Ligand binder design. Structure first.
Ligand SMILES: *[C@@H]1O[C@H](CO)[C@@H](O[C@@H]2O[C@H](CO)[C@@H](O[C@@H]3O[C@H](CO)[C@@H](O)[C@H](O)[C@@H]3O)[C@H](O)[C@H]2NC(C)=O)[C@H](O)[C@H]1NC(C)=O
Ligand SMILES: *[C@@H]1O[C@H](CO)[C@@H](O[C@@H]2O[C@H](CO)[C@@H](O[C@@H]3O[C@H](CO)[C@@H](O)[C@H](O)[C@@H]3O)[C@H](O)[C@H]2NC(C)=O)[C@H](O)[C@H]1NC(C)=O
Lengths: 61, 216
């Protein structure tokens, strides 16, 4: 339903994150991953960036 | 300003943060949107404990709903509280495609003292420069459709949002009385200067609603 128009550039520490989900819809222009922080606000992140892919790995484990 | 000048002169070695957002959202409605003057405004502060960290996580969240659109602005810091004191909306209630305007501001130090981010060798400033997050989100209510840089996330539902233009700043409250400051962040999406100008003259042709929190 929702699209990421602007990304968080810097890496947030894994501890500050909570949950994660991807976005691959045709409606949205750029590919994106949406992390949910402890304080229950969602954050847009670029998957073309190792720090995001590593954050996804940690959440899986 | 009378309160301001006295403060900035009497507090010249300190640094108080001041967040300001001016945002314009291009609005479109579902065919079943019924025009409404309704406005909903809220400001919520929360505190969460981090696992390996000694520093609490502080969030201030301003929300507004009007014209079928619901907006969320969250400013999050690690060890640093920057609370919102003001949200204002400018909106057209009709079906026609229109612009929604949003102001969001943090408490001015002279009204009620925020923390001196210059204390302990500028510890507070380092936290903001390194950790502060801004998450702006924009959705479509319960409309049914047919089936230096501030680090900011912008997340929108495109079914009701045709455009976003915003300017956002996090700066030394008293930067007008200083040649330089370690605290001066800024952010843009689209034409930020344009929205910063437009938003000061929308009361002529828009519903205006605002929420200002108790000072003191
Ligand atoms: C704009 O308003 C809409 C509608 O109020 C918000 O979306 C809705 O958010 C609610 C949370 O209050 C969601 O309900 C949740 O459902 C899931 C199950 O799918 C469950 O995990 C939760 O316990 C909760 O019951 C709802 O799904 C969601 N969407 C709709 C269409 O209603 C939206 O959050 C608001 N946008 C902004 C930026 O604030
Ligand atoms: C966002 O914040 C800005 C800055 O505080 C607000 O700008 C203010 O806009 C109002 C009207 O929109 C200006 O009103 C002035 O007074 C009378 C009202 O009858 C009007 O006839 C004058 O011509 C004049 O515009 C006010 O000067 C202006 N303030 C500043 C400091 O520029 C704006 O209202 C806020 N936007 C929202 C809530 O959407």
């Amino acid at each position: 339903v929702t699209c990421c128009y602007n990304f968080t550039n810097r890496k947030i520490s894994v501890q500050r994150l909570a949950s994660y989900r991807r976005i691959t819809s045709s409606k949205c222009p750029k590919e994106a991953v949406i992390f949910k922080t402890i304080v229950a606000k969602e954050i847009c992140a670029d998957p073309k960036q190792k720090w995001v892919q590593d954050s996804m790995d940690h959440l899986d484990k | 300003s009378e309160e301001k000048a006295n403060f900035c002169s009497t507090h010249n070695d300190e640094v108080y943060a001041r967040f300001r957002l001016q945002m314009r959202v291009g609005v479109r409605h579902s065919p079943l949107y019924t025009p409404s003057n309704m406005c909903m405004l809220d400001i919520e502060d929360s505190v969460e404990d981090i696992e390996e960290s000694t520093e609490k996580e502080y969030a201030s969240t301003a929300t507004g709903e009007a014209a079928g659109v619901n907006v969320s602005v969250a400013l999050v810091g690690e060890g640093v509280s920057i609370p919102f004191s003001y949200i204002g909306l400018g909106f057209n209630p009709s079906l026609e495609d229109s612009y929604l305007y949003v102001n969001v501001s943090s408490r001015a130090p002279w009204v009620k003292q925020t923390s001196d981010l210059s204390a302990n060798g500028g510890w507070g400033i380092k936290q903001v420069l390194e950790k502060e997050l801004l998450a702006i989100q924009i959705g479509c209510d319960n409309q049914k459709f047919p089936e230096a840089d501030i680090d900011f996330s912008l997340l929108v539902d495109p079914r009701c949002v045709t455009s976003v233009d915003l300017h956002v700043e996090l700066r030394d409250a008293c930067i007008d009385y200083k040649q330089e400051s370690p605290l001066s962040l800024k952010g843009k999406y689209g034409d930020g200067e344009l929205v910063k100008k437009e938003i000061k003259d929308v009361g002529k042709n828009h519903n205006m609603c605002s929420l200002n929190l108790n000072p003191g």
